[PDB]
Each structure stands twice: as structure tokens, then as C-alpha cells.
Design a protein around this ligand. Structure first.
Ligand code: HEM
Ligand code: HEM
Lengths: 200, 200
């Protein structure tokens, strides 16, 4: 990912906000020289992605984690709201299409996490926190977590590098920007809300 | 990505349908040994992902494409609709959360595409095809495409391997499945439509 300066975050806190708000990430490493990726929930420990640690889990039956010891460089991609920008919306000619999106990429050293129960329970808490109502696990559910635990592999990534981009049409003139924002308001409220929040 | 058999596509055509319907992909390769990923629109040439060719573009100012010659193994990830499944929705105890999603991963050899104008114009056609109304480029827009062309790098991937997963709660009993489907109907119609289409 190349971060074009015109799409840099306006505030440094935006990157960790995106990460916390979009935890279903892509965990990428090399296996036999080819990138392989697993879709998995990953949470952040730390006030920032830089200097932070990421914690996730996958199925033990997914062999991806077995390659971590010999190929430990990982990339984790967090993808926020996104949407195609058609020239139909611009209503200007000549025009070129684009795609709007926000993302945070973090790279670092992966290690298997022995404290898998703590990782999955903290993942529950982080993914339920923005919900209304939120689910909290009963003792019976926690007992079931202990029965499920042999089938899970948890992991930690100490973040070495990080980048973020908020490609949200903010380089447009006010007239076309309003057209883009209003078209997403109806078709993609998550992206429209991200645009609004990235202006307040 | 490990494809759990219970989440395999019901029909072989579903993978290419997902790819065509979700062209904003993640293009991943190794650069200095670490995975790096660019978010870019990628289209499919062929009736299937297997035996197919993928075609995309990125900015010339994005240095990712410069690593293609020495590290040519690429992974392209197409991500369809997705959404968190909270135990709140199940209304059963004990429970464990999950995430529902569909994705197609394709790996192969990348090569730079000399026919960049054709790649970007076919990308316009593919991304406008499902829209109503669709935008077609006027001669003035095509003239502008020619002025923009020096700033773009196009590329091709001959697909060597492919996998797809449709993790859409279809392993649940009818009662919980209806609860999941109805909760997404209101909060995530794209995912609910994908679930429905993956049942017809
Ligand atoms: C919000 C919380 C959670 C989410 C979104 C989530 C999501 C997921 C996903 C997407 C997978 C598949 C990973 C892969 O492809 O390898 C998975 C696997 C798994 N998770 Fe979680 N999970 C959550 C919490 C938990 C908890 C609390 C436990 C308790 C131990 C748990 C146990 C497991 C197990 C056993 C598997 C493997 C199942 C199998 O082999 O089919 N997860 N989870
Ligand atoms: C539906 C069609 C299209 C979509 C969704 C799209 C999307 C994108 C995206 C996401 C990027 C940034 C890539 C990166 O991060 O490296 C990009 C770059 C670029 N695209 Fe496209 N594009 C489309 C069609 C076109 C067409 C028809 C042209 C005409 C030549 C074009 C020319 C360019 C150029 C010049 C750049 C680089 C701009 C810069 O350096 O800032 N694109 N496009």
C-alpha cells in the first residue's frame, strides 16, 4: 500500500480507531514462498498501532499457523468501509472512476500465544463493546469456551511498522464531494459515517 | 485460508460470481521478504477463476509493482459481503461468536501488462455492468484516460491455484439460521442477499 499524502489520516488516532472498529482482518504470511492469508478477528493492545501488539486466533485445523515458526514475518490488514465511486455520481465530464476506502496495515513478528483463552475472551469483549445490546458470556458459555479451546490457535504480533490510508474523496471540490457523500449516504451508510467522522 | 468443507460453495460458478461482483481486491506479494498488499480493482478473464487470468492496475507512484519482477508470486484476495455473528442473535446459551464471509483467493505469476489502456477500459466496463444506470465513457473521457495513462501500471496474473469459501451459517439448524438471516436483512442486506443467493 502506498499512502498518497492527500489521503493521509487527518488525526493520528484515526488508525487505531479503524483497527478497533474493523477487527475482521486479513493475516498474511509466506508459506513455501507464496503469500497465504487467513480471515480472522484480530484485536489491538496499546493506545496506538505503532508500539502496539495485535492478538488473534484461527482454527487449529487451519494449517496456516504451522508456518509461523519458519516464516514469522506477518502483515495484518484491517479494512474499513469502502465503496466504488462511479462517474455517474460526479455528473461531470470528462471523468475517471475510483474506489474509496480506509485501511490500516501493520507488519511484525508473529508468535504463538499460549494464553488462548485470554485472547478469545478479550476478542469477545472487543467485538461486543460497540454493540447495543452487548453479549456477555454466561458461566455456561465460558465452560463451553474451555471445551472449544483445543481446536483454536491464538497468536500475537508485535507491530514493527504501520501505515494507514483514508481515501475518502476529501481531495474533491465541495460540489463533487457533496455528490459523493450523498450517494453513499443512501447506498453505504458505514462509509458515509466514516467520511463524516473523518471531517469532525 | 483453510476451506472448511461445511462452508464450500454449493455450486462451482459461485467463485467467479463473487470475483466479478467484488472486484476491489487485495493484491499481495513479498517485498524484501515481508508481504505487502495493495488495494486495487482486479477483473477476471475466463469463465472460471481456475484457468483464468486476472487483470488489474495501480498507481505508477505506488512502488509495489516494482517488486514484481524479482518477487513474482502473487496472491489476490477477493472479499465479498461479511458480518459479525453475535450470540445475541442466536438467543441460545451456551454460545460462541463467529464471523460470516465469502472470499476467493487466487495465486499465480504476475506480469506487467503493456496494454494498460485496455486493462483500465475493461475495468470500467466490468465495474459499471452491474449498475443501473451505468456510465459509459464519452470521447472526452477516453481522451482524458490517454492523458492519465502515464501514471498507471497495469498487470496480469495467470491463475495457478484458487480456493473459495462461503462461510454463511449454512451449518446451523433452521431456527438459528433464520435468526442470523433476519438480523442481517436489516443490518447488512448485501450479506443477506448473498446468503439467499447461496440457497437458490
Ligand atoms: C467475537 C469473537 C469471535 C469471532 C469473531 C470468531 C471468529 C472465528 C473465525 C472466523 C474462525 C475461523 C478461523 C479460520 O479460518 O481458521 C474461528 C475459529 C474458531 N474459533 Fe473463534 N471467534 C470468536 C471467538 C471465539 C471464542 C470465544 C472461542 C472459544 C474457544 C473460539 C473458538 C474457536 C474455534 C474452536 C475455532 C475453530 C473451529 C473449527 O475448527 O471449525 N472463538 N473463529
Ligand atoms: C472502475 C474503474 C476504476 C477504479 C475502481 C479505479 C481505482 C483506482 C485506485 C483504487 C487507484 C489507487 C491504486 C494504488 O493505490 O496504487 C487507482 C490509481 C490510478 N488509476 Fe484507476 N481506477 C479505475 C479506472 C481507471 C481508468 C479508466 C484510468 C485511466 C487511465 C485510471 C487511471 C489511474 C491512475 C492514473 C492512477 C494513479 C493516480 C495517482 O498517481 O494518484 N483508472 N485507480
Amino acid at each position: 500500500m502506498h499512502v498518497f499524502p492527500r489521503y493521509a489520516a487527518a488525526r493520528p488516532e484515526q488508525a487505531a480507531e479503524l483497527v478497533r472498529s474493523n477487527p475482521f482482518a486479513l493475516v498474511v504470511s509466506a508459506v513455501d514462498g507464496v503469500p497465504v492469508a487467513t480471515h480472522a478477528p484480530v484485536i489491538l493492545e496499546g493506545d496506538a498501532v505503532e508500539g502496539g501488539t495485535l492478538l488473534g486466533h484461527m482454527a487449529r485445523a487451519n494449517p496456516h499457523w504451522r508456518s509461523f515458526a519458519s516464516s514469522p514475518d506477518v502483515l495484518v490488514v484491517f479494512s474499513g468501509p469502502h465503496g466504488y465511486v462511479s462517474p455517474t455520481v460526479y455528473a461531470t465530464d470528462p471523468a475517471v472512476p475510483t474506489w474509496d476506502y480506509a485501511a490500516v496495515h501493520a507488519t511484525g513478528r508473529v508468535e504463538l500465544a499460549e494464553d488462548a483463552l485470554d485472547v478469545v475472551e478479550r476478542t469477545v469483549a472487543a467485538l461486543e463493546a460497540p454493540r447495543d445490546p452487548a453479549w456477555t458470556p454466561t458461566p455456561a458459555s465460558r465452560e463451553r469456551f474451555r471445551a472449544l479451546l483445543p481446536g483454536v490457535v491464538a497468536f500475537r504480533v508485535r507491530v514493527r511498522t504501520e501505515q494507514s490510508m483514508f481515501k475518502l474523496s476529501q481531495d474533491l471540490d465541495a460540489e463533487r464531494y457533496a455528490r459523493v457523500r450523498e450517494a453513499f449516504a443512501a447506498d453505504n451508510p458505514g462509509l458515509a459515517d466514516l467520511m463524516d467522522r473523518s471531517l469532525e
